PDB file of N, CA and C in Angstrom:
ATOM      1  N   UNK W   4       3.350  -1.480 -10.892  1.00 14.24           N
ATOM      2  CA  UNK W   4       2.406  -1.587 -11.340  1.00 14.24           C
ATOM      3  C   UNK W   4       2.193  -3.017 -11.675  1.00 14.24           C
ATOM      4  N   UNK W   5       2.927  -3.896 -12.734  1.00 17.50           N
ATOM      5  CA  UNK W   5       2.951  -5.165 -12.869  1.00 17.50           C
ATOM      6  C   UNK W   5       2.890  -6.756 -11.685  1.00 17.50           C
ATOM      7  N   UNK W   6       4.955  -5.459 -10.939  1.00 17.38           N
ATOM      8  CA  UNK W   6       5.561  -5.926 -10.425  1.00 17.38           C
ATOM      9  C   UNK W   6       4.213  -5.769  -8.531  1.00 17.38           C
ATOM     10  N   UNK W   7       3.572  -4.677  -8.425  1.00 16.71           N
ATOM     11  CA  UNK W   7       3.027  -4.577  -7.316  1.00 16.71           C
ATOM     12  C   UNK W   7       1.478  -6.075  -7.432  1.00 16.71           C
ATOM     13  N   UNK W   8       1.244  -6.127  -8.401  1.00 16.38           N
ATOM     14  CA  UNK W   8       0.214  -7.029  -9.211  1.00 16.38           C
ATOM     15  C   UNK W   8       0.685  -8.663  -8.497  1.00 16.38           C
ATOM     16  N   UNK W   9       1.961  -8.763  -8.970  1.00 18.82           N
ATOM     17  CA  UNK W   9       2.742 -10.035  -9.399  1.00 18.82           C
ATOM     18  C   UNK W   9       3.289  -9.839  -7.307  1.00 18.82           C
ATOM     19  N   UNK W  10       3.298  -8.839  -6.872  1.00 17.76           N
ATOM     20  CA  UNK W  10       3.412  -9.113  -5.127  1.00 17.76           C
ATOM     21  C   UNK W  10       2.066  -9.831  -3.967  1.00 17.76           C
ATOM     22  N   UNK W  11       1.307  -8.808  -5.026  1.00 22.12           N
ATOM     23  CA  UNK W  11      -0.147  -8.978  -3.852  1.00 22.12           C
ATOM     24  C   UNK W  11      -0.518 -11.168  -4.521  1.00 22.12           C
ATOM     25  N   UNK W  12      -0.110 -11.196  -5.586  1.00 23.12           N
ATOM     26  CA  UNK W  12      -0.473 -12.747  -5.660  1.00 23.12           C
ATOM     27  C   UNK W  12       0.537 -13.407  -5.138  1.00 23.12           C
ATOM     28  N   UNK W  13       1.696 -13.469  -4.702  1.00 25.00           N
ATOM     29  CA  UNK W  13       2.484 -13.911  -4.362  1.00 25.00           C
ATOM     30  C   UNK W  13       2.096 -14.282  -2.771  1.00 25.00           C
ATOM     31  N   UNK W  14       1.695 -12.959  -2.071  1.00 22.76           N
ATOM     32  CA  UNK W  14       0.908 -12.709  -0.522  1.00 22.76           C
ATOM     33  C   UNK W  14       0.079 -13.115  -0.713  1.00 22.76           C
ATOM     34  N   UNK W  15      -0.663 -13.573  -1.703  1.00 23.64           N
ATOM     35  CA  UNK W  15      -1.626 -14.614  -1.070  1.00 23.64           C
ATOM     36  C   UNK W  15      -1.669 -16.138  -1.604  1.00 23.64           C
ATOM     37  N   UNK W  16      -0.495 -16.025  -2.205  1.00 21.72           N
ATOM     38  CA  UNK W  16       0.158 -17.895  -1.735  1.00 21.72           C
ATOM     39  C   UNK W  16       0.738 -17.955  -0.822  1.00 21.72           C
ATOM     40  N   UNK W  17       1.207 -17.357  -0.176  1.00 20.16           N
ATOM     41  CA  UNK W  17       1.665 -17.458   1.010  1.00 20.16           C
ATOM     42  C   UNK W  17       0.837 -17.470   1.714  1.00 20.16           C
ATOM     43  N   UNK W  18      -0.536 -16.618   2.191  1.00 15.83           N
ATOM     44  CA  UNK W  18      -1.454 -17.023   2.785  1.00 15.83           C
ATOM     45  C   UNK W  18      -1.960 -17.944   2.517  1.00 15.83           C
ATOM     46  N   UNK W  19      -1.712 -18.072   1.097  1.00 15.87           N
ATOM     47  CA  UNK W  19      -2.854 -20.264   1.332  1.00 15.87           C
ATOM     48  C   UNK W  19      -1.753 -20.875   2.224  1.00 15.87           C
ATOM     49  N   UNK W  20      -0.437 -20.730   1.639  1.00 16.56           N
ATOM     50  CA  UNK W  20       0.205 -21.347   2.303  1.00 16.56           C
ATOM     51  C   UNK W  20       0.079 -22.216   3.657  1.00 16.56           C
ATOM     52  N   UNK W  21      -0.323 -20.896   4.384  1.00 15.84           N
ATOM     53  CA  UNK W  21      -0.031 -20.611   5.745  1.00 15.84           C
ATOM     54  C   UNK W  21      -1.030 -21.365   6.401  1.00 15.84           C
ATOM     55  N   UNK W  22      -2.130 -20.944   5.746  1.00 11.71           N
ATOM     56  CA  UNK W  22      -3.092 -21.810   5.985  1.00 11.71           C
ATOM     57  C   UNK W  22      -3.170 -23.332   5.919  1.00 11.71           C
ATOM     58  N   UNK W  23      -2.377 -23.968   4.444  1.00 12.78           N
ATOM     59  CA  UNK W  23      -2.610 -25.391   4.886  1.00 12.78           C
ATOM     60  C   UNK W  23      -1.499 -25.644   5.957  1.00 12.78           C
ATOM     61  N   UNK W  24      -0.771 -25.172   6.012  1.00 13.29           N
ATOM     62  CA  UNK W  24      -0.038 -25.789   7.100  1.00 13.29           C
ATOM     63  C   UNK W  24      -0.486 -25.503   8.486  1.00 13.29           C
ATOM     64  N   UNK W  25      -1.101 -24.632   8.978  1.00 13.12           N
ATOM     65  CA  UNK W  25      -2.229 -24.652  10.276  1.00 13.12           C
ATOM     66  C   UNK W  25      -3.086 -25.845  10.190  1.00 13.12           C
ATOM     67  N   UNK W  26      -4.069 -26.931   9.042  1.00 12.76           N
ATOM     68  CA  UNK W  26      -5.025 -27.392   9.019  1.00 12.76           C
ATOM     69  C   UNK W  26      -4.104 -28.109   9.238  1.00 12.76           C
ATOM     70  N   UNK W  27      -2.727 -28.548   8.159  1.00  8.05           N
ATOM     71  CA  UNK W  27      -2.140 -29.307   8.343  1.00  8.05           C
ATOM     72  C   UNK W  27      -2.002 -29.858   9.936  1.00  8.05           C
ATOM     73  N   UNK W  28      -1.067 -29.511  10.721  1.00  8.62           N
ATOM     74  CA  UNK W  28      -0.508 -29.206  12.699  1.00  8.62           C
ATOM     75  C   UNK W  28      -2.459 -29.756  13.041  1.00  8.62           C
TER      76      UNK W  28
ATOM     77  N   UNK R  19      -7.049  -8.650 -22.511  1.00  9.30           N
ATOM     78  CA  UNK R  19      -7.871  -9.286 -22.068  1.00  9.30           C
ATOM     79  C   UNK R  19      -6.419 -10.333 -21.297  1.00  9.30           C
ATOM     80  N   UNK R  20      -5.561 -10.125 -21.097  1.00 10.02           N
ATOM     81  CA  UNK R  20      -5.091 -10.261 -20.639  1.00 10.02           C
ATOM     82  C   UNK R  20      -5.256  -9.663 -18.810  1.00 10.02           C
ATOM     83  N   UNK R  21      -5.476  -8.387 -19.212  1.00  7.91           N
ATOM     84  CA  UNK R  21      -5.959  -7.026 -18.166  1.00  7.91           C
ATOM     85  C   UNK R  21      -7.096  -7.893 -17.086  1.00  7.91           C
ATOM     86  N   UNK R  22      -8.663  -8.933 -18.005  1.00  4.32           N
ATOM     87  CA  UNK R  22      -9.272  -9.276 -17.480  1.00  4.32           C
ATOM     88  C   UNK R  22      -8.442 -10.800 -16.445  1.00  4.32           C
ATOM     89  N   UNK R  23      -7.734 -11.167 -17.287  1.00  5.76           N
ATOM     90  CA  UNK R  23      -7.260 -12.434 -16.914  1.00  5.76           C
ATOM     91  C   UNK R  23      -6.299 -12.338 -15.883  1.00  5.76           C
ATOM     92  N   UNK R  24      -6.078 -11.203 -15.767  1.00  3.16           N
ATOM     93  CA  UNK R  24      -5.445 -10.661 -14.403  1.00  3.16           C
ATOM     94  C   UNK R  24      -6.521 -10.777 -13.173  1.00  3.16           C
ATOM     95  N   UNK R  25      -7.179  -8.953 -13.532  1.00  2.51           N
ATOM     96  CA  UNK R  25      -8.990  -9.447 -12.682  1.00  2.51           C
ATOM     97  C   UNK R  25      -9.280 -10.845 -11.550  1.00  2.51           C
ATOM     98  N   UNK R  26      -9.755 -11.526 -12.615  1.00  2.00           N
ATOM     99  CA  UNK R  26      -9.920 -13.170 -12.514  1.00  2.00           C
ATOM    100  C   UNK R  26      -9.264 -14.100 -11.102  1.00  2.00           C
ATOM    101  N   UNK R  27      -7.820 -13.425 -11.745  1.00  4.62           N
ATOM    102  CA  UNK R  27      -6.874 -14.243 -11.286  1.00  4.62           C
ATOM    103  C   UNK R  27      -6.868 -13.368  -9.425  1.00  4.62           C
ATOM    104  N   UNK R  28      -7.074 -12.459  -9.434  1.00  5.12           N
ATOM    105  CA  UNK R  28      -7.248 -11.728  -8.131  1.00  5.12           C
ATOM    106  C   UNK R  28      -8.243 -12.070  -7.601  1.00  5.12           C
ATOM    107  N   UNK R  29      -9.178 -12.214  -8.450  1.00  9.18           N
ATOM    108  CA  UNK R  29     -10.535 -12.259  -7.337  1.00  9.18           C
ATOM    109  C   UNK R  29     -10.880 -13.503  -6.985  1.00  9.18           C
ATOM    110  N   UNK R  30     -10.304 -14.551  -7.778  1.00 10.89           N
ATOM    111  CA  UNK R  30     -10.355 -16.446  -7.202  1.00 10.89           C
ATOM    112  C   UNK R  30      -9.217 -15.495  -6.374  1.00 10.89           C
ATOM    113  N   UNK R  31      -7.978 -15.027  -5.890  1.00  9.73           N
ATOM    114  CA  UNK R  31      -7.062 -15.238  -4.476  1.00  9.73           C
ATOM    115  C   UNK R  31      -8.330 -13.990  -2.943  1.00  9.73           C
ATOM    116  N   UNK R  32      -8.669 -12.801  -3.843  1.00  9.30           N
ATOM    117  CA  UNK R  32      -9.361 -12.361  -2.567  1.00  9.30           C
ATOM    118  C   UNK R  32     -10.762 -13.400  -2.492  1.00  9.30           C
ATOM    119  N   UNK R  33     -10.980 -14.593  -3.294  1.00  6.63           N
ATOM    120  CA  UNK R  33     -12.179 -15.368  -2.874  1.00  6.63           C
ATOM    121  C   UNK R  33     -11.593 -16.429  -1.364  1.00  6.63           C
ATOM    122  N   UNK R  34     -10.181 -17.050  -2.006  1.00  8.47           N
ATOM    123  CA  UNK R  34      -9.440 -17.646  -1.073  1.00  8.47           C
ATOM    124  C   UNK R  34      -9.387 -17.076   0.464  1.00  8.47           C
ATOM    125  N   UNK R  35      -9.269 -15.486  -0.035  1.00 11.07           N
ATOM    126  CA  UNK R  35      -8.687 -14.871   1.595  1.00 11.07           C
ATOM    127  C   UNK R  35      -9.370 -14.580   2.282  1.00 11.07           C
ATOM    128  N   UNK R  36     -10.556 -14.390   1.407  1.00 14.56           N
ATOM    129  CA  UNK R  36     -12.038 -15.016   2.336  1.00 14.56           C
ATOM    130  C   UNK R  36     -12.999 -15.961   3.012  1.00 14.56           C
ATOM    131  N   UNK R  37     -12.531 -16.916   2.443  1.00 14.00           N
ATOM    132  CA  UNK R  37     -12.335 -18.740   3.069  1.00 14.00           C
ATOM    133  C   UNK R  37     -11.669 -18.948   3.621  1.00 14.00           C
ATOM    134  N   UNK R  38     -10.111 -18.042   3.617  1.00 13.45           N
ATOM    135  CA  UNK R  38     -10.026 -18.678   4.678  1.00 13.45           C
ATOM    136  C   UNK R  38     -10.181 -18.026   6.619  1.00 13.45           C
ATOM    137  N   UNK R  39     -10.030 -16.385   5.980  1.00 13.84           N
ATOM    138  CA  UNK R  39     -10.484 -15.733   6.626  1.00 13.84           C
ATOM    139  C   UNK R  39     -12.040 -16.287   7.577  1.00 13.84           C
ATOM    140  N   UNK R  40     -13.212 -16.622   7.121  1.00 13.97           N
ATOM    141  CA  UNK R  40     -14.326 -17.630   7.137  1.00 13.97           C
ATOM    142  C   UNK R  40     -13.736 -18.947   8.240  1.00 13.97           C
ATOM    143  N   UNK R  41     -12.552 -19.666   7.609  1.00 14.92           N
ATOM    144  CA  UNK R  41     -13.041 -20.765   8.745  1.00 14.92           C
ATOM    145  C   UNK R  41     -11.712 -20.524   9.585  1.00 14.92           C
ATOM    146  N   UNK R  42     -10.581 -18.973   9.684  1.00 15.32           N
ATOM    147  CA  UNK R  42     -10.277 -18.935  10.789  1.00 15.32           C
ATOM    148  C   UNK R  42     -11.105 -18.248  11.738  1.00 15.32           C
ATOM    149  N   UNK R  43     -12.528 -17.642  11.589  1.00 13.90           N
ATOM    150  CA  UNK R  43     -13.767 -17.470  12.160  1.00 13.90           C
ATOM    151  C   UNK R  43     -14.239 -18.494  12.897  1.00 13.90           C
TER     152      UNK R  43
END
């Protein structure tokens, strides 16, 4: 369960990074 | 307390995802 929560947090971080990159582009 | 902190982090992640989706729309 803890690993799943960490994976969800990592996915959210990756989505935020992708959104930031798209905004920069 | 740790679970409450994790839930707050998850809520923040969900809010960020919703904001990103709204920006995309």
